[PDB]
Amino acid sequence: MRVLVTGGSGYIGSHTCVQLLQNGHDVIILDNLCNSKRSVLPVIERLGGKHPTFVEGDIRNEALMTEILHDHAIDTVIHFAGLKAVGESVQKPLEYYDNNVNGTLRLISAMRAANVKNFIFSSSATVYGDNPKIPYVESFPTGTPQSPYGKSKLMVEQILTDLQKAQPDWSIALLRYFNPVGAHPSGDMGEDPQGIPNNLMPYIAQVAVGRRDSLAIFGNDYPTEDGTGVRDYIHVMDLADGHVVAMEKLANKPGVHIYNLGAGVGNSVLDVVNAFSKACGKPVNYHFAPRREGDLPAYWADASKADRELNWRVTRTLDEMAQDTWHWQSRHPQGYPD
Amino acid sequence: MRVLVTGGSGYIGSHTCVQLLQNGHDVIILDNLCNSKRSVLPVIERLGGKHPTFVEGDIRNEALMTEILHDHAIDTVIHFAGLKAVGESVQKPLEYYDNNVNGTLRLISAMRAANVKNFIFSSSATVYGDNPKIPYVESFPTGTPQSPYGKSKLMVEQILTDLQKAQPDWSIALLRYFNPVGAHPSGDMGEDPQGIPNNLMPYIAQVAVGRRDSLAIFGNDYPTEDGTGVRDYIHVMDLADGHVVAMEKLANKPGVHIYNLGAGVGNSVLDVVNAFSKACGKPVNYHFAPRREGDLPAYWADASKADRELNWRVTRTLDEMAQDTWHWQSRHPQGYPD
Ligand SMILES: NC(=O)c1ccc[n+]([C@@H]2O[C@H](COP(=O)([O-])OP(=O)(O)OC[C@H]3O[C@@H](n4cnc5c(N)ncnc54)[C@H](O)[C@@H]3O)[C@@H](O)[C@H]2O)c1
Ligand SMILES: NC(=O)c1ccc[n+]([C@@H]2O[C@H](COP(=O)([O-])OP(=O)(O)OC[C@H]3O[C@@H](n4cnc5c(N)ncnc54)[C@H](O)[C@@H]3O)[C@@H](O)[C@H]2O)c1
Ligand SMILES: O=c1ccn([C@@H]2O[C@H](COP(=O)(O)OP(=O)(O)O)[C@@H](O)[C@H]2O)c(=O)[nH]1
Ligand SMILES: O=c1ccn([C@@H]2O[C@H](COP(=O)(O)OP(=O)(O)O)[C@@H](O)[C@H]2O)c(=O)[nH]1
Ligand code: NA
Ligand code: NA
Ligand code: NA
Ligand code: NA
C-alpha cells in the first residue's frame, strides 16, 4: 500500500517505516524535524531495504498535506507526528493543543479533501485517566487525563470517532500505547532524545553511558511489590510490527478500531533498572526520590483484543528491550549526526 | 474598557455589544458574517448610543487577531464566535472542531502574542453531560457531552483552564449558557436564524408569524410534570447584562471563574408555548412528535454562585421573553436586510 507516515523520522515512526518497507509498502515520510534529524533517513532506507520518500513539512499545513496525499496517491495514513513531553505540556499547553489537536484536525481535513479514508493514530494509555481497574481494557470508558498532553490525545480520539460517524466509510485505528522502549536490533537506530530524557529507559541509558550520575527513582512507597511504579514496557520493534499489521488488516474496513498495544504485563522501575544493569555489564547507579506529580502507582495493558482480532502479540522480552537500547546507546553515544 | 467582542454581530453578541456601549466601553466587533449580517451594525450603534468598530474576519486567522488586539489596545476579550447547530455538528464534526476548538485556540494564542490576559468565553450547559442531579452546579465535575458541538465547548473549557494554570496572571470566565431567548425590548434587534430554526422559541415564533404550520413538540412522555422537556430559559438582555458585569468585575482578577448564567428555574415546552400564545394573541399550533435524539428530560441552572459573587441575577420574565420575541418577529418578519 501507499502510506503516509507523519512523524516518520521520530522514534516509533522510524522503526515503523523500516518494517513497512520490509513488507514492500511504498512509504512517504512527513516530518517537521522539530524532534528528529534528517540523518535518520538513510538508516531507515538501509534497514528497510527500500527508499522511503521524505517531505519536510508540518501537519498543521493543511494545503501541503492535501497536496502530498494527492501527489502520492496515498491509501492510508499513519499519524505519529505531535509533541509528547508531559511536563512541558503542563508548562506550554497551547503548543500541545496546537500540534496535537489542531495538527491532527488539519491532517484529517486534508484527507477528506483528498478522499483518503484509512487512518492509524498514535494514541495513549493516558486516555484511561485515573483508572483503578488494571489491566486497562478497550471496553473501559475513558477517564480524565491529568496533563494537557493526555487531554490532547483523548480529544483527538473523540474527534476521530465523530468523524468516523459522519463519514462511515472511514477505517480509523486508535492504537493506545503504553511504554515503548528498545531499539532496532542493529544498534544503528533508536530513541534519540535531546536534553534531559523524560522517560525511564533513556534516562537509565544515559546514566549507564556515563553522561548522568544517578537515576532518580520517583517514589518507593507505592502499593506495589517492590514499592516502585509499575508499567507495561513494549519493545519498539513489536510496536512497529503491530502498526504494520493494523494497517494491513484494517485498511478499508469501516469503523473505529481501538486497540491497546502493550505486552500485557507489568514491570517495576527496579525490574527495568536490574535488566539494564545486566545488559550493560555494570550496576546502574540510582537513588530514591519523591513521587512524580500526577503519577499512578501501577498499570498495564490488557492486550487480548489485539491478539484475538489482529493475531498480534509482543515477541521481544524485557531483557531484549534493555539490551537493544544499550547496544544503540553504546554504538551511537551522540545519537544521529547533525 | 477596550473590549474585543468576537461573534459580536450574532444573536447574543449583538445584545451584549449594546449593553457594553451603554456602559461606555469601547467596543471592537470581530465577525466573519457566516451567521449574521452587516445590517445589524447600525442597530447596535443606535441602541448602544455609541459607535462600535467593526472588523470582518475570522477567529481562525491568528495573525489578524493579533493585529486587531494590538491595534486597538484591547484590555479584554469576549468570545461568542463559533458554530452552534447541534444536529449539524453531528453531521459535520470537523467544521465544529475547527471553528470552535481551533478557532478559540488561534484567538487565545493571538492574545498571548499581544499580551492580552482577560477573557470571557461563551460556554454551555452541555458540558455537564448526562447529569441526573439538577439543578446543575458549577461545583459538579463535567460529564461527557453527546454531540460534537457539546464536546467542542468542553474541550475549550479544558484548554482555557490549562492555559490559565500555565499563565496564572490570566483572568478567564467560563460562562455556561442554558437556553437564551428573547430580544431587545425595542423590537428592532433579535435572533435572526437562517432556514429552519433549531431552537424552540424561534421555531414557535415562525409558526406564530405564519411561516410554519405546527410546532413539533419533541416527546410528551418524559418524567416531567406535563410530560414535555423542561429547560432554563434566560432573556438575552439578562444574559447580556451578566456579560458586562462579569467583564467589569473579573478583569485583572486572576483565575478561572466559572458561572452558570440562567434563571435558576425550569419551564416545560408547553409553558413556553402557552406564554407565546398569550404574547401573540392567538393559539400557537403544535403537535406531539417523538423524542429528539440525545435529549434530556429536564435540567436547569443553579445560579446562586453568580448572584453571590457577581451580584447578578435575572430580572426579565418568561412572559417578557415571549413578548419581546414576538415584538421583534412581528416588526421584522424578514429579519435584518441584505
Ligand atoms: N504513552 C503514550 O502516550 C505514548 C508513548 C510514546 C509515544 N506516543 C505517541 O506516539 C507518537 C510517536 O512518538 P515518538 O516517541 O516516536 O516521538 P518522537 O518525538 O520521536 O516522534 C514524533 C515525530 O513528530 C515530529 N513532529 C512533531 N510535531 C510535528 C508537526 N507539527 N508536524 C510534523 N512533524 C511533527 C517530530 O519532529 C518527530 O520526528 C507521538 O504522537 C507520541 O505522542 C504515545
Ligand atoms: N446551550 C449553549 O451551549 C449555548 C446557548 C446559545 C449560544 N451559545 C454560544 O454562545 C455563542 C453566541 O451564540 P449565538 O446564539 O449568538 O449565535 P450566533 O450564530 O448568532 O453568533 C455567533 C456569531 O459568530 C460568528 N462566527 C462564527 N464562526 C466564526 C468564526 N470562525 N470567526 C468569526 N466569526 C464567526 C457568526 O457569524 C455569528 O455572528 C456561541 O459560541 C454559542 O455556541 C451556547
Ligand atoms: O527518571 C525517571 C523516569 C521515570 N521514572 C518512573 O518510571 C515509570 C515510567 O515513567 P515514564 O516517564 O518513562 O513513562 P510513563 O509511565 O509516565 O508514560 C514511572 O513509574 C516513573 O515514575 C523514574 O522513576 N525516573
Ligand atoms: O422544534 C422544537 C425545538 C425544541 N423542542 C424542545 O424544546 C427544548 C429546548 O430545545 P432547544 O433545541 O431550543 O435547546 P436545548 O435545550 O436543546 O439547548 C427541548 O426540550 C426540546 O426537545 C421542541 O419540542 N421542538
Ligand atoms: Na451523517
Ligand atoms: Na546528538
Ligand atoms: Na508553569
Ligand atoms: Na432575512
> Which residues sit directly before a break in chain A (C to N > 2.5 Å)?
none
Contact assessment for residue A279 and residue A322, using Cβ atoms and an 8 Å cutoff: yes
Q: Which residues contact B109 (CB under 8 A, 6 or more apart)?
A: A94, A98, B62
Q: Which helix (H) or strand (E) holds B333?
A: none
Pocket test for ligand 1, best of A9, A11, A18, A156 (most atoms within 8 A of CB): A11
Q: Which residues of chain A does B92 touch, with a Cβ-Cβ cutoff of 8 Å?
A: 166
The grid cell for B285 is 399550533
The grid cell for B215 is 410546532
The sign of the CA dihedral A150, A152, A153, A159 is positive
Nearest listed ligand to the Cα of residue A122: 1
Neighbours of ion ligand 8 (CB under 5 A): B 334-335
Binding positions of B for NAD(+): 11-12, 31-36, 58-59, 80-84, 99, 124, 149, 153, 178
* DSSP bridge partners of B286: B215
The one-letter code for the residue type at B132 is P
Q: Tell me how far apart the alpha carbons of residues B205 and B280 are, in angstroms, rounded to a whole number.
A: 9
Sequence-ordered alpha helix ranges (H) in chain B:
11-22, 40-48, 62-71, 86-91, 93-96, 103-114, 148-166, 200-208, 236-250, 269-280, 304-310, 318-331
When CB atoms are compared, the residue of A105, A155, A158 closest to B98 is: A105
Residues of A with CB under 8 A from a CB of B: 90-94, 97-98, 101-102, 105, 108-109, 112, 148, 151, 155, 158-159, 162-163, 165-166
Contact assessment for residue B148 and residue B89, using Cβ atoms and an 8 Å cutoff: yes
Q: Is B293 in the pocket of ligand 4 (CB under 6 A)?
A: no
Contact assessment for residue B63 and residue B103, using Cβ atoms and an 8 Å cutoff: no
This structure was determined by X-ray
Q: Tell me how far apart the alpha carbons of residues B242 and B176 are, in angstroms, rounded to a whole number.
A: 11
CA of A20 to the centre of ligand 3 (A): 29
When CB atoms are compared, the residue of A92, A98, A105 closest to B94 is: A105
How many residues belong to chain A? Answer: 338
A199-206 CB contacts, 8 Å cutoff, 24+ apart: A200/A231, A200/A269, A200/A272, A201/A233, A201/A272, A201/A276, A201/A321, A201/A322, A201/A325, A202/A325, A204/A272, A204/A273, A204/A276, A204/A284, A205/A276, A205/A325, A205/A326, A205/A329, A206/A329
Q: Which is the closest atom of ligand 4 to the Cα of B217?
A: 24
CA A106 to chain centre: 20
Question: CA of B92, closest CA in chain A: separation in Å?
Answer: 7
- Residue A148's closest chain B neighbor by CA? B162
The sign of the CA dihedral B103, B109, B113, B118 is positive
Residues A162-180, buried b or exposed e (16+ Cβ, 10 A)? bbbebbeebbbbbbbbbbb
Q: Tell me how far apart the alpha carbons of residues B223 and B299 are, in angstroms, rounded to a whole number.
A: 12
Which of the residues A97, A128, A136, A149 is marked catalytic? A149
Which domains are assigned to chain A? 1-181+232-262 (3.40.50.720), 182-231+263-338 (3.90.25.10)
3-state helix/strand/coil string of chain A: CEEEEECCCCHHHHHHHHHHHHCCCEEEEEECCCCCCCCHHHHHHHHHCCCCEEEECCCCCHHHHHHHHHHCCCCEEEECCCCCCHHHHHHCHHHHHHHHHHHHHHHHHHHHHHCCCEEEEEEEHHHHCCCCCCCECCCCCCCCCCCHHHHHHHHHHHHHHHHHHHCCCCEEEEEEECEEECCCCCCCCCCCCCCCCCCHHHHHHHHHCCCCCCEEEECCCCCCCCCCCEECEEEHHHHHHHHHHHHHHHCCCCEEEEEEECCCCCEEHHHHHHHHHHHHCCCCCEEEECCCCCCCCECCECCHHHHHHHCCCCCCCHHHHHHHHHHHHHHCCCCCCC
The grid cell for B29 is 466587533
Q: Tell me how far apart the alpha carbons of residues B178 and B172 are, in angstroms, rounded to a whole number.
A: 19
Query: Nominal resolution in Å?
Result: 1.8
Contact assessment for residue A313 and residue A245, using Cβ atoms and an 8 Å cutoff: no
The sign of the CA dihedral A288, A290, A295, A297 is positive
Q: Tell me how far apart the alpha carbons of residues B169 and B117 are, in angstroms, rounded to a whole number.
A: 7
Annotation says A149 is catalytic? yes
Nearest listed ligand to the Cα of residue B270: 4
Q: Which residues contact B205 (CB under 8 A, 6 or more apart)?
A: B197, B276, B325, B326, B329
Q: Tell me how far apart the alpha carbons of residues B13 and B236 are, in angstroms, rounded to a whole number.
A: 9
Q: Tell me how far apart the alpha carbons of residues B99 and A74 are, in angstroms, rounded to a whole number.
A: 27
- Residue A92's closest chain B neighbor by CA? B166
Distances (CA, A) of A118 to A93, A189, A248, A255, B45: 29, 28, 10, 10, 51
Q: How many CB pairs under 8 A join A and B?
A: 65
- Residue B108's closest chain A neighbor by CA? A94
Q: Which residues contact B195 (CB under 8 A, 6 or more apart)?
A: none
Q: Which is the closest atom of ligand 3 to the Cα of A203?
A: 1
Q: Which residues contact A139 (CB under 8 A, 6 or more apart)?
A: none
- How buried is residue A73: exposed, middle or buried, by Cβ count under 10 Å (0-12/13-18/19+)? exposed
Q: Is A179 in the pocket of ligand 3 (CB under 6 A)?
A: yes
The cell 468570545 sits on which residue?
B79
When CB atoms are compared, the residue of B102, B109, B159 closest to A105 is: B102
Q: Which residues of chain B does A101 touch, with a Cβ-Cβ cutoff of 8 Å?
A: 97, 101-102, 105, 155
Query: What is the DSSP pairing of strand A267-268 with strand A230-231?
Result: antiparallel
Question: CA of B155, closest CA in chain A: separation in Å?
Answer: 7
Q: Tell me how far apart the alpha carbons of residues A69 and A2 are, in angstroms, rounded to a whole number.
A: 10
